Amino acid sequence: PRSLKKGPFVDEHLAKKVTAQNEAGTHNVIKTWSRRSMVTPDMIGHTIGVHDGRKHVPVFVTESMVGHKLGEFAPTRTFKGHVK
Amino acid sequence: AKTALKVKAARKPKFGVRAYTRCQRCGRPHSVYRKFGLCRICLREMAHAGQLPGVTKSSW
Amino acid sequence: QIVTEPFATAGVEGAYDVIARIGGGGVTGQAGALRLGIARALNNVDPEASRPALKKAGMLTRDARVKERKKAGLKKARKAPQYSKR
Amino acid sequence: PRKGPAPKRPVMVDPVYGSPLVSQLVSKILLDGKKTVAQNIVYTALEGCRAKNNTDPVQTLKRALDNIKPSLEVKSRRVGGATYQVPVEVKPARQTTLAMRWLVNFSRERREKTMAERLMNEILDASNGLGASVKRREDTHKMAEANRAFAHYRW
């Protein structure tokens, strides 16, 4: 994982969008392609549409999400099983 | 290789880590030697033709 | 034994000192090199009374057996990758 | 090979016991290319031999080898539509090789803990006239006697 002394990586536009949402009301879905970013407490209770390759799947970030990346909650491959 | 890819590789990347080598004669992105640029095929043919000083076949 | 036996096969025996400086190789290779060196020293000291027996014992000879080089397409000098028909 | 009999590498003698037999034994144990490990095993076995009986360990090894040496053994033959087991006499070098190989293999197969005195136990048993090696020698001789009717196929 990322070095501790480098701090968490939030993609610096997701951060600004969630801060603006905090300032103007925590009610909107924030569309982003930043699977790369780190969930932080400052965005807790938001809903973020994380890109998964072809669609911005929405995730409602809760308290326990914080120690995870945004892309962990937007699966990229679909399997459904072999045969049927 | 594609001309657009060659020029994109030539130009400075956005992030330093995103740069790569490309065969400077050939455009090939695989098996490019740092010592003399070029690539696998370019090295072989140019060494045979004798344009690379010091480079000769090895049979030790 | 491989380093002491030059004296044993020569007329002189373990009443004759030797000083050796040894480099490179492993323990057995160093032993063989030291044996050949002692044999050559005895040779060029007494090339008439120790030369015949010393050479007959196959000791005034350096074996050229050296690790054969690895070859492309092969796992080792002669070992080949496991052939798999179909 | 087609060309002819390839030359044989001369067998060296053991520095300690002064017998080519022990050198052949260590070269037969000689797993993984570890000569020192193999001859540590062999020397330990021979010393255990001289411990359990006063006689010389090289002599007891020799007696074991004579007790395991086969005289004749059968080989497959492709005469006709069925395979035959033709008995063939065994030369002294081949039979010494067979005795050593059987000794080492059955020592490895013995149930005791350590290889050194597994081999020591097997050597003593063979010298006495017992053990898996002697049993295999007797079985091969028995099967050669059973198939003795094909001694006329020798070429």
């Binding site: - | 010592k35 003399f36 640029g37 045979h48 033709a49 004798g50 344009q51 076949k57 | - | -």
Partner: protein, 206 residues
């Protein structure tokens, strides 16, 4: 398909490298400029006929030997073409170029010019058998000890590809002390291109 380049095979043994410079921190960039120089010269001086381009460097100064059959094209009128090609060379590289152009004493014996001529005839749609026989006869009139020519491709504008060859004398490809000059060219026809390879056994060298 399975034969080594004669020049690479004899490199260091009998024949020598075309480039003579030493550099251990720029090696790649000097190689790149050399490639640019050679490509430019080949692309813009087909008419002269290039046997070889030999490159030397001393200190930020490049020296180009151009071995050409007819340096009349290279020199133009009173060296005007030579000056213009030199100027294009500074424009391309950025270094001081000293360019000298040399003759080939026996163009009919140098293999590279022989391939040049055979490919030119093939492009001009001359019968390949007649062209190969003419080149072979001219080489042996000059006095080469052995000729071998091979033209591969859609010879005669056909559909299937052929590999027609001529040879007589002796061409010991396997002998390293044998001085064998090797040339290759591509005839650009309305039907793809024909590969013409020429081996010429000049003689034996120490």
């Amino acid at each position: 398909g399975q034969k080594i380049n004669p020049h690479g095979f004899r490199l260091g043994v009998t024949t020598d490298h075309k480039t003579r410079w030493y550099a251990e921190k720029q090696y790649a960039e000097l190689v790149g400029e050399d490639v640019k120089i050679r490509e430019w010269l080949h692309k813009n001086l087909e008419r002269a006929g290039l046997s070889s381009i030999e490159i030397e460097r001393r200190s930020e100064r490049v020296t180009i030997f151009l071995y050409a059959a007819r340096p009349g094209i290279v020199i133009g009128r009173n060296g005007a073409e030579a000056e213009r090609v030199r100027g294009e060379l500074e424009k391309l590289t950025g270094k001081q170029i000293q360019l000298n152009i040399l003759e080939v004493k026996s163009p009919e014996t140098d293999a590279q010019l022989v391939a040049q001529g055979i490919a030119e005839q093939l492009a001009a749609r001359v019968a390949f058998r007649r062209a190969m026989r003419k080149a072979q006869q001219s080489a042996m009139n000059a006095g080469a000890l052995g000729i071998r020519i091979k033209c591969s491709g859609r010879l005669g504008g056909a559909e299937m590809s052929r590999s027609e060859g001529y040879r007589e004398g002796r061409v010991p490809l396997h002998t390293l002390r044998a001085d064998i000059d090797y040339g290759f060219f591509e005839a650009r026809t309305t039907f793809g291109r024909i590969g013409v390879k020429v081996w010429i056994y000049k003689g034996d060298v120490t």
